[PDB]
Amino acid sequence: TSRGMITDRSGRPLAVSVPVGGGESRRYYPSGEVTAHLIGFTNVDSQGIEGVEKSFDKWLTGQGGGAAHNLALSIDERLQALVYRELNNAVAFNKAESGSAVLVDVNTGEVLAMANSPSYNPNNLSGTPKEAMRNRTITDVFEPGSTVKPMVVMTALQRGVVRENSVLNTIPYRINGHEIKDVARYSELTLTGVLQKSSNVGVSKLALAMPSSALVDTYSRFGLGKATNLGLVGERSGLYPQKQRWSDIERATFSFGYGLMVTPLQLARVYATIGSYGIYRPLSITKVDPPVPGERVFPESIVRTVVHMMESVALPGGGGVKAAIKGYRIAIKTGTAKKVGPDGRYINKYIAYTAGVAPASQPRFALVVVINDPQAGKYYAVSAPVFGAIMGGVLRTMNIEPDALT
């Protein structure tokens, strides 16, 4: 009973069948824990139980349809190695419960890296709990939080509510008895400064100045609330509101990223669309033959301005300045939210997230880093330095020319 070999986009083996004894062979995974959640494993026989080993189980064995075939995943093992190395050490350094990282190609939609910490070893599953086996990038959902602020600015600019050079009044006001305030109370902020300071007061004025169906339509255009369609087991599509009646406070919280749950993979597809300047391309786990046309969902001119405004988050003044990369311009968005247990309420456990694209001149990659439950450490976010460390290694490995002056 033989089985085909799955490799990366360049041919590096990720799961092979090596002979143990006369004729009989055993499945070997040379990447080990670096790509355990995506590749998967097999039992005593040659059957797929998790990951790609199960999603492509018929293509690998090929029983009844020719000989066994090989599969080239869209993953780059060079990028997958550095993504897991920086993420697995960050979850341990911050004493986090778990951590997820998804790297997506902007121009093709191909998933270049997908890591989860903690992980298991598919070569010997002895002593590995099930809690550290599920692909948390597609099975876990969370509130995107401040990462949806760029799409709120895209809608206000497109709907003519606010111009690119408009100064908003960020005075802390109340919405029927709810203190909408920021940490640093600014009297007024420019439209670029709203994304720089992640001002909730600024984006709340934008959401209430347009119908509730505006942001509901904008998030859906970038992929929020839609299935990623990869074929992996447990691939969740998130929780998206399908209501028609909104309140004055639910429209504001919807602008803050709270009220909807999405997977780390869905959030990566959103910024992969932001990087493409408003082009929605489907995600893929295997190597794709270019070109991938996709579909435009937002005007290019509006997304271009917002991408340029997201660079202030990494520059001196923004909340993601700790994620900067030497000699590169990045358009990122970091923040920290609160976990939601099975009861549906907020528990005293936080979630740090950071999503962005690089380089800001013409982005080629989209990265999402989620650090779940950072017990030890400080937030003044824990996921910002991991973004610059992961993205920094990606830009250097792919030989991307520098963007900013050193």
Curated annotation (Swiss-Prot):
Entry EC no(s): 3.4.16.4
UniProt keyword list: Carboxypeptidase, Cell cycle, Cell division, Cell inner membrane, Cell membrane, Cell shape, Cell wall biogenesis/degradation, Hydrolase, Membrane, Peptidoglycan synthesis, Protease, Septation, Transmembrane, Transmembrane helix
Activity regulation behaviour: Inhibited by beta-lactam antibiotics such as penicillin, moenomycin, macarbomycin, furazlocillin and piperacillin. Antibiotics inhibit the activity by binding to the catalytic serine.
Subcellular localization: Cell inner membrane
Topology Periplasmic: residue spans: 1-406
InterPro entries: Bact_Transpept/Beta-Lactamase, Beta-lactam/transpept-like, FtsI_transpept, PBP_dimer, PBP_dimer_sf, PCN-bd_Tpept
Gene Ontology, cellular component aspect: cell division site; divisome complex; plasma membrane
Chief subcellular location: membrane
Enzyme category, top tier: hydrolase
Chemical reaction(s) catalysed: Preferential cleavage: (Ac)2-L-Lys-D-Ala-|-D-Ala. Also transpeptidation of peptidyl-alanyl moieties that are N-acyl substituents of D-alanine
Domain of life per record: Bacteria
Active site: S146
GO biological process: cell division; cell wall organization; division septum assembly; FtsZ-dependent cytokinesis; peptidoglycan biosynthetic process; proteolysis; regulation of cell shape; response to xenobiotic stimulus
One matching Pfam family: Transpeptidase
Annotated signal peptide: none
Membrane disposition: Single-pass membrane protein
Function: Essential cell division protein that catalyzes cross-linking of the peptidoglycan cell wall at the division septum. Required for localization of FtsN.
Similarity comment: Belongs to the transpeptidase family. FtsI subfamily.
Subunit structure: Homodimer. Forms a complex with FtsW. Interacts with FtsQ.
Protein name according to UniProt: Peptidoglycan D,D-transpeptidase FtsI
Native source species: Escherichia coli (strain K12)
Gene: ftsI
